[model samples]
Target: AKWVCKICGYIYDEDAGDPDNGISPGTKFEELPDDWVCPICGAPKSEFEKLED
Candidate 1:
């Protein structure tokens, strides 16, 4: 599964987490921690929309 930062269209690929944000690869959306803010726009985790479709 994947997610997108609704604020700035930053794609959050679960298969490869953003390592620059300290998010290790293979981390799932469910594991996207509370402090995980979209690096592109600084939006909170809850602002992302899951791409399950």
Candidate 2:
């Protein structure tokens, strides 16, 4: 699933993570902070919805 950061449009895929950022494969979103963050803008996780469109 691709989750986007509304603040900076940073897109992350929990299903297949980005090892460059330390989130290697098998690291689901929960393994990250319960509330994830925006690496681009340093914004807190909020106002997010699973991609449906």
Candidate 3:
């Protein structure tokens, strides 16, 4: 399963956590901090959409 930022199409892959933001690999989307925003477009989590795959 994966999540996508609807605003900018930023894909957050669970298997590849955003290490640049201190998020370790294998970290799930829900495990991210509330203040975490899309690194690509600065969009909030509320603007993200869960992928069916």
Top candidate (TM-score): 3
Ranked by TM-score, top first: 3, 1, 2
lDDT tens readout by residue for model 3, 1-53: 68989999999898999999989999989999999999899998899888995
Candidate 2 achieves a global lDDT of: 0.67
Candidate 2 local lDDT, 1-53, one digit each (tens): 77777777777677677676667776655567755566677777674445658
| Number of colliding residue pairs in each model | 0, 0, 0
Q: Which stretches of candidate 2 lie over 4 Å from their true place?
A: none
Global fold similarity of model 2 (TM-score):
0.61
| Range of the 10 consecutive residues with the lowest summed lDDT in candidate 2 | 43-52
Q: Give the candidate order by descending lDDT.
A: 3, 1, 2
CA lDDT, candidate 1, residue 49: 97
Off by over 4 Å in 3: none
Q: Which candidate would rank higher by TM-score, 2 or 3?
A: 3
Residues 3-47, candidate 1, lDDT per residue (tens digit)?
988999999998889899899999998897899899899999989
Candidate 3's C-alpha lDDT? 0.91
Q: Candidate 1 regions off by >4 Å?
A: none
